Design a protein around this ligand. Structure first.
Ligand SMILES: *[C@H]1O[C@H](CO)[C@H](O)[C@H](O)[C@H]1O
Ligand SMILES: *[C@H]1O[C@H](CO)[C@H](O)[C@H](O)[C@H]1O
Ligand SMILES: *[C@H]1O[C@H](CO)[C@H](O)[C@H](O)[C@H]1O
Ligand SMILES: *[C@H]1O[C@H](CO)[C@H](O)[C@H](O)[C@H]1O
Ligand SMILES: *[C@H]1O[C@H](CO)[C@H](O)[C@H](O)[C@H]1O
Ligand SMILES: *[C@H]1O[C@H](CO)[C@H](O)[C@H](O)[C@H]1O
Ligand SMILES: *[C@H]1O[C@H](CO)[C@H](O)[C@H](O)[C@H]1O
Ligand SMILES: *[C@H]1O[C@H](CO)[C@H](O)[C@H](O)[C@H]1O
Length: 97
């Protein structure tokens, strides 16, 4: 996105735009600086800008769309297998003679 008005970015690939700091003229007096147009890295003083703040004719961009939802918890595990069923009865010993 372009840096908005009164914001500038110099180093490329910058995460967030930075506001123009006030310009200290010396002796403790500071004149704040306003960017001329969108996406500019030059902080011109607000008194000397060719285009006044009123002359800006850009519809302010829509606010951030909401952040996505969270990832569902780990689904449960399949039921554990059951033990081997009981062995069948053993054969009765041979009947007497
Ligand atoms: C929102 O930003 C625009 C510039 O796109 C303009 O400065 C408006 O005045 C502001 O409300
Ligand atoms: C979230 O809202 C903005 C407007 O603020 C825009 O419509 C996006 O498309 C939406 O995802
Ligand atoms: C989650 O993301 C939105 C953009 O979709 C926005 O940056 C919020 O500030 C963040 O928490
Ligand atoms: C098991 O359940 C979770 C939610 O508890 C999620 O829907 C997974 O996709 C499903 O496999
Ligand atoms: C029995 O086996 C299941 C998998 O089918 C799971 O690991 C349970 O934790 C275990 O008790
Ligand atoms: C014998 O019993 C076990 C559990 O008691 C299991 O159900 C087997 O399938 C059955 O043959
Ligand atoms: C006697 O024989 C049966 C199967 O023929 C089974 O193994 C019993 O455990 C055994 O006592
Ligand atoms: C004689 O005895 C054996 C077991 O001792 C068996 O029950 C036969 O059926 C019976 O005839």
């Amino acid at each position: 996105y372009k840096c908005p008005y009164d914001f500038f970015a110099d180093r490329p690939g910058v995460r967030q735009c930075t506001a123009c700091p006030p310009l200290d003229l010396g002796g403790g007096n500071l004149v704040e600086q306003c960017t001329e147009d969108l996406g500019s890295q030059r902080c011109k003083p607000c008194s000397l800008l060719s285009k006044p703040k009123t002359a800006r004719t850009e519809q302010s961009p829509p606010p951030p769309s909401p952040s996505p939802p969270p990832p569902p918890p780990p689904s449960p595990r399949p039921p554990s297998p059951n033990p081997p069923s009981p062995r069948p009865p053993s054969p009765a010993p041979p009947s007497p003679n």
